[PDB]
Amino acid sequence: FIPWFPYDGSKLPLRPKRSPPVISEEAAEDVKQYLT
């Protein structure tokens, strides 16, 4: 298998500054119970 764009450290990518949320097993409990 050959990737088309192997990792190249001289062309760094963009990413969002913000982080995804931290979700606890308790917030996950409320999501399941409330939001299906």
Binding site: W4, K11, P13, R15, A28, K32
Partner: protein, 201 residues
């Protein structure tokens, strides 16, 4: 007359959003409880019901959309990170858009959505072919552009209060990773292949 650069950007962005959700689910980045099983492309998917997670993913891909329509994207990468924010696993979506010529048939469209469905189906069962290392606890999305990333900054910043930055080596680089191919598609309007980088043995 019709913006097929926009059509492929739309289809890809919609697909990438579903794939991100499914990756988080299958690789247990977040508790399974937040996910609702739905249907997309006539196949099963697992979508988060957590509002802030949903908004992060939607905003991320909405910012990528203008770069896709300009054919400026080489890779979209989901990086799973551990508590120290070291990469555990990377889901690499390599993308090329060929010149949109010979664009006809009633069939070139649903052919693409069935080709994209093959990626969703494979992610659903990708635990079968990936290493069983401890799961991560957070993630980021990397956008690799054909031109210098630093000059896609104005263009990618579509959403107020959702800024982008150039990634740090630390958060992206895996040393000697094991490459596990998952799926490859070719079509007249889009070619794509998906593989996973695992930590080296």
């Amino acid at each position: 007359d019709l913006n097929f650069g926009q059509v492929v950007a739309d289809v890809l962005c919609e697909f990438l959003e579903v794939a991100v959700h499914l990756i988080l689910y299958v690789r247990e980045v977040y508790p399974v409880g937040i996910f609702q099983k739905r249907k997309k492309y006539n196949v099963p998917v697992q979508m988060s019901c957590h509002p802030e997670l949903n908004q992060y993913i939607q905003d991320t891909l909405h910012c990528v959309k203008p770069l896709l329509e300009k054919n400026d994207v080489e890779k979209v990468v989901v990086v799973i990170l551990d508590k120290e924010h070291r990469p555990v696993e990377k889901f690499v979506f390599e993308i090329t858009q060929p010149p949109l010529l010979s664009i006809s048939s009633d069939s070139l469209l649903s052919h693409v959505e069935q080709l994209l469905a093959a990626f969703i189906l494979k992610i659903s069962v990708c635990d079968a072919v990936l290493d069983h290392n401890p799961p991560g606890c957070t993630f980021t999305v990397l956008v690799h552009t054909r031109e210098a990333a630093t000059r896609n900054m104005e263009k990618i910043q579509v959403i107020k209060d959702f800024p982008w930055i150039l990634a740090d080596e630390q958060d992206v680089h895996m040393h000697d990773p094991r490459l596990i191919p998952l799926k490859t598609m070719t079509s007249d309007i889009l070619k794509m292949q998906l593989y996973v980088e695992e930590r080296a043995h």
